[PDB]
Design a protein around this ligand. Structure first.
Ligand code: ZAN
Ligand code: ZAN
Ligand code: CA
Ligand code: CA
Ligand code: CA
Ligand code: CA
Ligand code: CA
Lengths: 934, 908
RNA sequence: CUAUGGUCGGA
RNA sequence: UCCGACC
RNA sequence: CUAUGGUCGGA
RNA sequence: CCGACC
């Protein structure tokens, strides 16, 4: 224990005042947030009484407004607010809505202040909706709390000295989180799980250097409204040791290593849709997994089991899938993995089966929540995959001819790049074609979410949506530079991402869920692939794969055996199973294991049927993996072993359960070297140009062990890595960064590595060229139509000096806004801040009334907004382009659509925001209209 | 009427002798419209003209070709992008009976049509087509000059004995086919007759359109059919084979003799019978198929194609066993309709008319229903199944509509599903608009909902929507279309690889065939029903097992029948083949399970009434002797004799309608009268190829003797909207139309007819501008004078409305309402070319809405629906809750509702 | 330095 | 860029 | 007097 | 309404 660290930790959480005690949790959570955002103290006695209006509020703004009446909060702008729908569910829906759960979340960062009197600064995140899990469905979404705390074991200079200077500081923080309850919004929260959230950006509001953080989950053991011994406001006291007992059934699972049992807490936190509750007589718990016909004892169906057609149909019905899913990824009590339809089920009786490989603990499957099929994902329409940097070295190593494939793969890159550019170049010629291309290039989900095309100031947020909106109003990309600039910026970034990452697209490739052949119709080295609908490559299209060789691989891929070549055979017996890849249950070892120790529990495989990539590949036998026992030490302490220290009985289990949390939290907070070790393997293999050498194979095994550290209880310290680096590896500790990690070639001579040849010799030369050709194929800013209103007002100015003053004030105000735009808290807030000043410009009688048209609620739909936009265009079309568009792009589109319309030639349509989002381009119309001209 | 026939065609005078054919045709057409007799000013501007309008302008002293066609005719040699321009004419009987011309000629404007082998080889300019009223017509409107029939032989002689002169070229008839009953241009059967230009003013004795070489029709036919080696064939069938030359086919490639595989024997039955199992179908290379995709713009290689290669006519399928990159094609005796050397490129060019494409649901034909009941193990079960499906389907259509109307977004999707306007949109480039609203009511509903109007809350929209369903329900009453989702019409191919057994078929889809709840990419382990139209015999529908063979997996959007077995399955299907035949394939269990097969019937020999002219070309030549002159005379005689055979009236339509009427009265399709009628109608369809001669006398003999009932047979009850028969309806069609569909339709109709919280015409949002300018007018007489004038002027227009051309006249007066100072300029924007986009138009629409929503509702929406939509979109927008978009007319017509958006949003 | 790849969802 | 599950 | 069914485009 | 095709 370290005293200085402990003193700062005594009061880091926001306090709950007596006045707020009556408040519902949702209002309490939101009111505390505003007070913190505005610096006001909740317990401050200078001004506080509960407002009955808060008890019955469907908008947070109403609650926050009553507080803003006090001057204390009046100066600061309002903080991010919970969406109204989430707030309503928290107050009246019991924190759950159509499977979704409101989540109380917080992010914690270190206090810059080093004063001995809070170590951590806390921001409570707004109320948000997130898919529910088993535990939220069983004990209440209101009894759970997530925090992102900076990891005590961070080796960053950013860490405060109090933690770094005083050893034992790590233990004090772990004790602080795991020893006792934490008070917040009237509830006592106890910790029960923690997982790595990765290196994260410290909050700017509080502070700039990334620090490793940890997600710690809390459970409300008790609260003010809690009752000793169903509604969120009247929960019954319950100890963390009891929720965990309900989930893991600890009594029958004391034989497991406690660190792995702690790992299984995630299965109760997995975000899943609840489908149905099977009856006990409908569950077939297999006691033996499918085993090798050879006799090797290898399991051939790891994590995959069968399910009835009726169960699959209910999944479709509950999720509105529209087609019955051949396979699903879900959890069923202790069972985790995949479930596939039994092709032999002819009845309508519900049934599911579990396998040992699936059941992660011993479960009795009695509670309804332990017999509920929770679905996390469904096999769905397949999309084309690409190559990645990890598959290239392995592809070169197993190539029969390395030189042939290096050029062959490079061909796919140059051909795809020229084709990518050619389609855009031709489409840019006609706006109907460019719109259709832009829609194909990328926003349905945002449109459904916002019920409108989301807008940042006066233009659509998305650049693809901005281009389509402007073209829909009559703007030509070949005639308006602003539109041209967007397409240029778009392609440049898309090419930049190809330069930065060699995501070489392979059309005859896809990521498909891996399933096992329970029916034994597939022989070893034979796979079955079926597609729900036509899979289209530009040259040809497929509904199934037959009479072809395919390459199956999984990420992460390090070993030469990680990519394997197999023959695709279509078995009419497995025709119903579509959008899945079925490996054989025959053979000594499951094919999935060859793929980076893969399973059929949710794993997806990279399937390539491209011949120019498949036929140059030869298979490798699985490698002899080294024994790294000295470097990697595994804690296999069982729950029973922890229990012996305490004794026998309920109290002993309760103490043991808390001890498992404390011990596991230390193991979790321990530093992970998976990234450093994988990066080292890349550097070493680059220097040696070998992914097959003994150092590579050793490093491939170490990275393979490190990824499974939490489940396998592996303790690895910086010392063991150095010890491993100096003994098994050739006494090299710090290795040079590779040339590819660099934008421009800094190497001596022609590129030597496969990735180097592709990045600097096949991609950058082609990319630099295709851009120039596209630029040459690609136009002013000026538009005599976008300034019709300016001409109208100058003519009016000649008639009246009052008409002249309005223009003078308008022009000067527009210039002030431009100065602000040049000067300007992230980018969106700055844009809105300039936009508010833009919309501020206002007429300030008969002319003013005609200009303001105040009967219209949106002033941005009045004639004055149009004149204000036309004048801005005349003022800044050459001077500052982005200003006129980012601000008045919407009104400019109105003007163009008004000007382009010509008598007797149809009628333009003013579409409501919502109805505009629903419409989509008709490809059929585009081809036929193009045909009539051509 | 020979004297009338002397001057039928428009005359060509010396002043037009030195003229391009395209200009001559167009100028002749214009003189005819203006009735200026051709019989001396020739403008040379025409020869280099690229638009007819410019040529026509020269004729300013006293139905028009598109620009592309005229250009192609003038400088493209009459051929562009495969298309050939066509000189078509329509002939109609002259009203005057003066011994004046018998027919009146209207030369149709030059137009693009798909090319044929004959147009490609000899030039489209050498081909002329006409639609002539048939001489054998029994209609009263036939002029007495021919009605007396002292005449049929003479008119046939006029068409075939000699050449005809129209635009400087001599035209001789080579082929004729039935064009059906066609209304005379301002109903009588017409025959299409095809003419070829043997000689012309620009022709050369012993190539450019204006520099052709003289070629007789006999020679052209000799090139196509190789008559020297085809004398054995009956002349009537050889005349029939001319159609293959005139078939509209896309030219893909010319194959070299070494790449052409000719087979001396077809695939025969392995069980000795010697029946043919591959009639009309052969194999091609994956490379040949790839070029069909490349030249035709297909997004995938076709697995089977329908086309012609020389003598061969039929279907070609990719060899699943072909691993090569070399072009090859196969020919079989069944496909070849004449002996061809395959020496000329035009006779070695693969010509594709159609490709196997994505399949669609077909539904149940009325012909199929009697056969289904006749061959069902339990008839009552079959009746209850199809009937219950119809009841369920009808309820679903209505249920979807009622739920859809509740939410705008949802209703828009249904309206698009109900009717597609893409054909109209692409042609106009915009949504067609009459006055102030879209021309189509369905488009009007979408346009107004897009601006924010709700059908449930707005009366105008509700009334239109109610009318649309009323029309759809009325359409349902008139015709009983039972629709089966698990049904499709698929091209039939044969198994060249021997995988399938006798009762097995293989079907694979190019994509996902979607049924309401289930989806298919292949058919496996299911029983299917295979049938063809026309289906009359009890055996014309057969039940088979669908087995997916991976060996045939690359063949998609085709159903493969077995080569094993005594008789091919196709023959069972109304005497079918694999030459382009499409089978109705149904895998809906409830339809399939009750069916049990029937063997092919023993058909009666009706030779007494059906006689075949099996006279051969050699027999016709024997009359003329031996030699080229004898062949020329025989070829011309065949055209003349064949023209008579073809012009003979066809009784298939009357005979089929009789079988339908008698079989309905008997309620049997398996009885002796039905089998006899079925054989007669089966033979009559193949009359042209088989030389069958049938006359009213032959028909009256069959009716008097075999069929019985030589009396007018009454029409079936199902042919009428309601059930006037006695008792509950007992015929399958009558039960389904009157005892099942009508009540269900009526129940929904009563529900719609049966129906303050409801649709109201009033919208406070639409009177916004009126109230805005009232407040100004109350404090300004100057504006008030303008306001009063507009209100009264609208009143004048409202009086003018009264109640397509008329609506436009009112719209013109409505647009005329315009101002007649700073205010008037703001109201009427000069900068805007379309003043319908100005502020004044919105004010006039608002003032018109308030004044006439109660009294003259239709007047406001027809005149100002456009502006009312703008006003609605403006008023409904709320600050910071999105931005309404002003689409252009063109960009608007190119947008379609995203079905995924409608479903996802409703779930929200 | 520095501390992984991949699938998908979001605002 | 940020946020959240999954292997 | 009345004079067929089906598949595919369309204007 | 006018075109292919079986
Ligand atoms: N964060 C990650 N980064 C890279 N690879 C990962 C990551 N997470 C999972 N994988 C891959 O997926 C595998 C994880 O396997 P599982 O998630 O199936 N867990 P497993 O070890 O099988 O234990 P059970 O829960 O099944 O009893 C790893 O070995 C990696 O190959
Ligand atoms: N106008 C029509 N009305 C009804 N059925 C028709 C019609 N035209 C064609 N069919 C159908 O298609 C069949 C024609 O068969 P084909 O078009 O296959 N010709 P076919 O007699 O076999 O001789 P070939 O040219 O192949 O040597 C008819 O028997 C009908 O089943
Ligand atoms: Ca594993
Ligand atoms: Ca796994
Ligand atoms: Ca696993
Ligand atoms: Ca036939
Ligand atoms: Ca990652």
């Amino acid at each position: 224990h370290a005293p200085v660290v402990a003193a700062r930790l005594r009061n880091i959480w926001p306090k709950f005042p007596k006045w707020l005690h009556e408040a519902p949790l949702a209002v309490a959570w939101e009111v505390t947030r505003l007070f913190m955002h505005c610096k006001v103290d909740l317990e401050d006695e200078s001004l506080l009484k509960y407002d009955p209006s808060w008890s019955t509020a469907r908008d947070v703004t109403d609650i926050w407004k009553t507080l803003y009446r006090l001057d204390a909060f009046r100066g600061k702008p309002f903080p991010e607010k919970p969406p109204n729908d989430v707030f309503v569910t928290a107050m009246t829906g019991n924190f759950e809505s159509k499977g979704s759960a409101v989540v109380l979340s917080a992010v914690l960062d270190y206090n810059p202040d080093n004063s001995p009197t809070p170590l951590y600064l806390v921001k409570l995140k707004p109320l948000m909706f997130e898919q529910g899990c088993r535990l939220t469905r069983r004990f209440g979404p209101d009894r759970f709390f997530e925090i992102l705390i900076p990891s005590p074991t961070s080796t960053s200079p950013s860490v405060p000295p109090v933690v770094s200077k005083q050893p034992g500081a790590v233990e004090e923080v772990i004790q602080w989180l795991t020893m006792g309850q934490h008070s917040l919004v009237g509830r006592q929260w106890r910790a029960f799980f923690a997982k790595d959230a990765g290196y994260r950006k410290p909050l700017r509001e509080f502070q700039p250097k990334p620090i490793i953080k940890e997600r710690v989950h809390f459970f409300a053991e008790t609260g003010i409204t809690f009752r000793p011994d169903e509604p969120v406001e009247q929960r019954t006291e319950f100890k963390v040791s009891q929720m965990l007992d309900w989930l893991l059934q600890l009594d029958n699972n004391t034989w497991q290593p406690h660190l792995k049992l702690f790992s299984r807490i995630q299965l109760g936190l997995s975000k899943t849709y609840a489908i149905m509750t099977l009856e006990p007589h409908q569950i077939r718990h297999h006691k033996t997994d499918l085993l090798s016909p050879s006799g090797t004892g290898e399991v051939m169906n790891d994590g995959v089991g069968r399910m009835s057609r009726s169960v699959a149909k209910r999944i479709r019905d509950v999720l509105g899938l529209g087609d019955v899913p051949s396979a699903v990824q879900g959890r069923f009590g202790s069972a985790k993995g995949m479930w596939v339809i039994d092709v032999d089920d002819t009845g309508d009786e519900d049934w599911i089966e579990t396998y040992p490989s699936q059941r992660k603990w011993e479960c009795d499957f009695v509670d309804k929540h332990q017999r509920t099929l929770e679905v996390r994902s469904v096999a769905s329409e397949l999309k084309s995959a690409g190559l990645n940097l990890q598959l290239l070295p392995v592809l070169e190593d197993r190539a029969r001819d390395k030189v042939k494939m290096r050029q062959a793969i490079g061909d796919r890159l140059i051909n795809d790049l020229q084709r990518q550019f050619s389609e855009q170049k031709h489409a840019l010629n006609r706006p109907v074609e460019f719109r259709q291309w832009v829609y194909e290039s990328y926003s349905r989900a945002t449109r459904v979410s916002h019920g409108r095309v989301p807008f940042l100031a006066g233009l659509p947020d998305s650049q693809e949506e901005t281009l389509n909106f402007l073209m829909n109003s009559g703007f030509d990309p070949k005639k308006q530079k602003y539109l041209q600039d967007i397409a240029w910026d778009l392609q440049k970034r898309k090419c930049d991402t190809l330069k930065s990452k060699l995501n070489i697209r392979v059309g005859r490739s896809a990521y498909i869920y891996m399933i096992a052949d329970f029916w034994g119709v597939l022989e070893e080295n034979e796979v079955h692939v079926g597609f729900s609908s036509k899979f289209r490559d530009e040259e040809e299209s497929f509904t199934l794969l037959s009479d072809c060789d395919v390459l199956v691989a999984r990420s992460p891929a390090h070993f030469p055996s990680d990519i394997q070549r197999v023959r695709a055979v279509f078995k009419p017996e497995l025709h119903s199973l579509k959008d899945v890849i079925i490996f054989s249950t025959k053979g000594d070892v499951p094919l999935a294991k060859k793929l980076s120790g893969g399973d059929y529990d949710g794993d997806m495989a990279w399937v390539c049927w491209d011949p120019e990539i498949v036929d140059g590949f030869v298979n490798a036998e699985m490698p002899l993996e080294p024994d790294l026992s000295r470097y990697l030490k595994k804690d296999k302490t069982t729950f029973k072993q922890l229990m012996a220290s305490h004794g026998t009985g309920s109290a002993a289990k309760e103490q043991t359960t808390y001890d498992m949390i404390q011990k596991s939290f230390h193991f979790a907070l321990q530093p992970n070297f998976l990234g450093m070790c994988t990066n080292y393997k890349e550097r070493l293999c680059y220097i040696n140009n070998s992914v097959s050498n003994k150092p590579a194979i050793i490093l491939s095994s170490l990275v393979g062990n490190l990824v499974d550290q939490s489940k396998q209880g592996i303790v690895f310290n910086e010392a063991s890595w150095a010890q491993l680096r100096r003994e098994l590896l050739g006494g090299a500790l710090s290795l040079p960064d590779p040339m590819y990690k660099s934008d421009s070639w800094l190497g001596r001579g022609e590129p030597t590595h496969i990735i180097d040849y592709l990045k600097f010799s096949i991609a950058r030369p082609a990319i630099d060229k295709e851009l120039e050709a596209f630029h040459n194929a690609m136009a002013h800013f000026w538009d005599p139509d976008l300034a019709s209103y300016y001409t109208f007002f100058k003519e009016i100015s000649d008639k009246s000096r009052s008409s002249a003053l309005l223009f003078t004030t308008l022009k000067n105000r527009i210039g002030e806004v431009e100065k602000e735009y040049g000067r300007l808290d992230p980018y969106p807030v700055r844009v809105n801040q300039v936009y508010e000043k833009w919309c501020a410009i206002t007429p300030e009688s008969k002319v003013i009334r005609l200009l303001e048209l105040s009967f219209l609620a949106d002033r941005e739909m009045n004639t004055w907004a149009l004149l204000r936009a036309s004048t801005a265009f005349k003022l800044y079309y050459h001077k500052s382009p982005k200003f006129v568009w980012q601000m008045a792009g919407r009104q400019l589109a109105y003007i163009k659509a008004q000007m382009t319309s010509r008598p007797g030639e149809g009628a333009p349509a003013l579409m409501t925001a919502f109805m505009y989002a629903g419409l989509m381009p008709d490809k059929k119309f585009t081809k036929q209209y193009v045909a009539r001209l051509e």
